[PDB]
């Protein structure tokens, strides 16, 4: 695809998400979701492989269905209230209606079934965009309408998100599928705290943003998509595998690494809201993410997997990429715990 | 600058530079058949860039000073050693072939990179599409285990699929009794002991496989030894094609911009060569691989990125 | 009997077995949208009505 065409396509996708976050009218919220969808498919089609076509088809069907289902939540709220303003809506069925409509876009509940497969089919760069930027728009609506949500319904959706998202992660070879399962698990953590206090729902977002940019662009720099392919990268560039294991540990949430900051604050909030069983179970399931995190770390840098004699050419040459913002990404994604009280800036 | 997306946007295209002297002609044939001699004559008489046959140290030639690095540091295989014991247990045979395939695959990219950045055609010996004739030959007498074929193919589809085929292929047809004639005059004791079967088994795989299936996507002209020496005859024959079949007479600036992206990135072009399927001949254990990498790293120039090695004389390191 | 058989089976191995036994069946999906969308239809149906989420 022509770079100028590619730049515009990304530009609309960014604006579509930007449109959602800046619209006080329910119709415009839908406009941003659809036109963001309208330009997401071609980016997944950049490689144009039969796997990508299967991935893009899967992604479009679920996203279009969720967006179309979103309209009734607007229409039903319209019907019972005559208000297009995006605020605390006035119908439990409509409130229920959109909550799964937005959840399918995020992929938390069994709705999450599209998240892994689409990432597998499409390229690493496209997966980075899909799992990081395309999660701001659905979250933006939930933050604004958080006051109207049924607590039981949303907490459940968050629970199965971390529950299933972490559980299946133990059985993934392809790194792309590992990342998506991690994404679903991280999806639950932010969504769980969403009804209680939206401030650290955002705090989880930018932090979870940081590793996924850090991990994916590290993976792109590695040019590896499988666990075995990642393992060979120790021979070429051992240093990169070293930073990845820092982020792998950090994204797992071990203190004092950055990834512990969200989970710690999340547990603190619902503990203030008298919900104390709910935080405990998610923390227990947090180790599930850490396991295949360790397995990748064991394969990447902690041990030293066998290499291939054909790796010798890679030594002679050098990388031509510029990996923009990678230096500041991992540093901001591994040691920011001392700067935790800065979360009041989000408020 | 390079062909980065800013360059293409600001106006850097590819169809403007290329002209009728933009071809991927490959002069090729059997062992010692004088193909390299004919390839040079085509290069001189057409103003067309030449590429000598990619050896074990062809990659070494591209990087650094071009001085052939140590076989331990680059290749873990010797053609002369393969001559002595073709069925050696160390896997010198397949390691030779796979490294050779990578070297010519790098050579193919270097030809395309220069061609697309200059518009001048490229002539090279034994394009990667013809590399299978040796592995087929090394498989018939069991010089390599059967599994080497699938891995060599597995690399071939995951790499050679994107690299599109040449324009016209020059073949120096040479019969085996003739091949058995010159190699005595060569003199190097390692190449005397080449089996007549090996010279046979390359020939038919060259004849019944390489030429016909690949002919449907580029012109093929067969020359024996006499029509090989006739540089005047072959060169006007090369000029006298329309070159319709093959992907080359169909693409636009869009593909060429993408093609120059992959080729310019020297890590990407051979990225799939280091395929993680494990076989004894090509797999090197962690201890041996790590120690060699330290030995590679401690070499001058390679300690840091190019233009960043103070030992060789990279001044202003604190400012670059 | 205890240190190398039971104490390693009650807490550690049982949880490890349960996780693995239920990691495979979650990840063992078919890739056919017909089943996935059928699962969504159940999810919409049960969530809207059965668990009294609407009321």
């Amino acid at each position: 695809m022509n770079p100028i065409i590619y730049t515009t396509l990304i530009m609309t996708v960014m604006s579509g998400t930007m449109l959602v976050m800046i619209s006080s009218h329910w119709l415009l919220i839908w406009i941003g979701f659809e036109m963001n969808l309208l330009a997401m498919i071609p980016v997944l089609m950049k490689n144009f492989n039969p796997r990508a076509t299967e991935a893009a088809t899967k992604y479009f069907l679920t996203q279009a269905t969720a967006s179309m289902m979103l309209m009734m939540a607007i229409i039903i709220n319209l019907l019972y209230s005559g208000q297009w303003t995006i605020t605390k809506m006035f119908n439990p069925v409509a409130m229920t209606m959109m909550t799964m409509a937005l959840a399918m876009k995020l992929g938390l509940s069994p709705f999450h079934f599209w998240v892994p497969e689409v990432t597998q089919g499409i390229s690493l760069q496209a997966g980075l965009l899909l799992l990081t930027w395309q999660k701001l728009a659905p979250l933006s609506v939930l933050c604004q309408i958080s006051q109207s949500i049924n607590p039981n319904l949303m907490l459940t959706m968050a629970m199965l998100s971390i529950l299933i998202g972490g559980w299946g992660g133990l059985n993934q070879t392809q790194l792309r599928k590992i990342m998506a399962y991690s994404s679903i698990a991280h999806m639950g953590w932010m969504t769980a705290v969403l009804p209680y206090n939206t401030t650290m729902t955002i705090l989880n977002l930018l932090i979870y943003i940081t590793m996924t940019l850090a991990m994916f662009m590290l993976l792109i720099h590695s040019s590896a998509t499988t666990t075995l392919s990642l393992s060979h990268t120790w021979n070429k560039m051992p240093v990169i595998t070293s930073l990845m294991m820092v982020t792998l540990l950090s994204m797992g949430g071990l203190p004092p690494l950055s990834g512990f900051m969200p989970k710690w604050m999340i547990i603190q909030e619902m503990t203030k809201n008298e919900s104390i069983i709910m935080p405990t179970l998610m923390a227990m399931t947090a180790l599930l993410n850490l396991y295949f995190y360790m397995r990748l770390a064991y394969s990447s840098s902690l041990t030293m997997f066998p290499s291939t004699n054909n790796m010798k050419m890679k030594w002679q040459f050098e990388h031509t990429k510029q990996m923009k913002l990678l230096p500041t990404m991992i540093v901001l994604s591994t040691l920011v715990l001392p700067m935790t009280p800065a979360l009041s800036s989000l408020n | 600058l390079q062909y980065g997306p800013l360059a293409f946007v600001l106006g850097e295209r590819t169809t403007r530079k290329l002209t009728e002297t933009s071809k991927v002609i490959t002069v090729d044939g059997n062992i010692c058949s004088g193909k390299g001699r004919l390839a040079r004559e085509i290069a001189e008489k057409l103003g067309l860039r030449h590429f000598p046959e990619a050896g074990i140290h062809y990659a070494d030639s591209t990087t650094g000073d071009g001085k052939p690095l140590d076989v331990q540091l680059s290749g873990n295989c010797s053609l002369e050693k393969f001559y002595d014991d073709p069925k050696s247990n160390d896997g010198n045979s397949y390691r030779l072939q796979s490294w050779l395939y990578a070297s010519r695959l790098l050579q193919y990219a270097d030809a395309l990179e220069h061609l697309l950045s200059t518009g001048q055609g490229v002539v090279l010996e034994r394009s990667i599409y013809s590399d299978f004739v040796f592995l087929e030959a090394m498989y018939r007498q069991g010089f390599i285990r059967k599994q080497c074929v699938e891995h060599y193919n597995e690399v071939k589809k995951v790499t050679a699929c994107e690299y599109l085929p040449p324009h016209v292929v020059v073949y120096v047809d040479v019969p085996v009794p003739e091949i058995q004639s010159r190699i005595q005059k060569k003199g190097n004791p390692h190449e005397m002991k080449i089996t007549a079967a090996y010279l046979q088994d390359i020939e038919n795989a060259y004849k019944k496989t390489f030429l016909p299936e690949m002919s449907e996507k580029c012109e093929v002209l067969q020359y024996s030894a006499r029509e090989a020496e006739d540089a005047e005859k072959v060169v006007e024959d090369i000029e006298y094609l329309k070159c319709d079949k093959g992907p080359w007479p169909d693409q636009d600036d869009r593909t060429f911009h993408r093609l120059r992206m992959l080729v310019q990135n020297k890590l990407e072009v051979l990225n799939y060569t280091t395929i993680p399927v494990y076989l004894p001949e090509i797999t090197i254990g962690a201890h041996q691989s790590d120690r060699v990498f330290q030995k590679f790293t401690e070499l001058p120039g390679r300690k840091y990125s190019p233009g960043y090695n103070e030992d060789v004389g990279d001044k202003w390191i604190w400012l670059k | 009997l205890l240190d190398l058989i039971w104490l390693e089976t009650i807490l550690p191995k049982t949880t490890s077995f349960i996780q693995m036994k239920m990691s495979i069946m979650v990840s063992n999906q078919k890739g056919l949208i017909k089943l996935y969308f059928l699962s969504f239809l159940i999810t919409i149906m049960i969530s809207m009505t059965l668990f009294n989420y609407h009321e």
Binding site: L170, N171, Q172, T173, T227, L228, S231, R295, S299, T303, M304, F305, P306 | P276, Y278, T283, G285, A286, H287 | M20, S23, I24, S27, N28
Partner: peptide, 26 residues
């Protein structure tokens, strides 16, 4: 020297799933 992974460890992590079954065998 310290033990390092070999083709046994690598193939343990290689394939479609490190936790395989008859359903995932094919």
């Amino acid at each position: 020297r310290q033990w390092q992974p070999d083709v046994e460890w690598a193939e343990q992590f290689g394939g479609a799933v490190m936790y395989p079954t008859k359903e995932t065998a094919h």
